[PDB]
Amino acid sequence: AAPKNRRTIEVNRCRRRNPQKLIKVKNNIDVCPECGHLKQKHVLCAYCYEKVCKETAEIRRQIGKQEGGPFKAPTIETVVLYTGETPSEQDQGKRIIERDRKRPSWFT
């Protein structure tokens, strides 16, 4: 079917600008106590998560170097190590991954 008459600006302005079609204010925002950036509650801090994922990205890169080719996932557990630290007695008998930097504060 086809419109029988042009809708006026006022009619349209009532459609468009009612509270239903408006953007609602979010009330669940907070400050990330860790980094001090803004995070939504119920959601992980975007900054903090990026930080983790950049670290874990590099760890996965070192995993590839040592593994060296597809279909070579080991049958032991894994541990990650940084500059100036040694595997414990219980750490013995599992895969070691080395690093060229200091251990992060948040990663313990």
């Binding site: 468009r16 953007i23 204010v25 979010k26 925002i29 803004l38 939504q40």
Partner: protein
Amino acid sequence: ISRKWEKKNKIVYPPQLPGEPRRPAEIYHCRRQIKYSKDKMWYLAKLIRGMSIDQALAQLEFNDKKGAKIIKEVLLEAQDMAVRDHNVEFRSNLYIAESTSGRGQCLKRIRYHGRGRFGIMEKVYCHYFVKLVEGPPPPPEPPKTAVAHAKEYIQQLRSRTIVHTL
């Protein structure tokens, strides 16, 4: 094309006498030719329309719409220049005075329908405008009380005249 909004930052007022209220600082800023619909931009403009800078940046951060990051940029640019050039003491004590989107210049392409028929498609562009006023944001007008309704009704009855006499 007109570019009035830019020039608004070049207005110089003469120095105030010590016996005067401290004039709020005043920053006008915009972005032109945003590839986004002007009416779509309106909703985001309308949202931040009366809030403080930080509170607007907060609201804009978690907003999913495309233009939301664009407005965030404009606001941060405006805040930066406010402190640097417009002699604003604190960056936090700014609120959005007016937030407006205009139609920018548009192009026309063709859309190919069935049979031989076609239509004229428009690559939509728009501008965004903002104004920042130094100081705490204005407290919203309180909702009208029963006593206020009553008060004004009394006023209204008292305004009656005997009509079409001397």
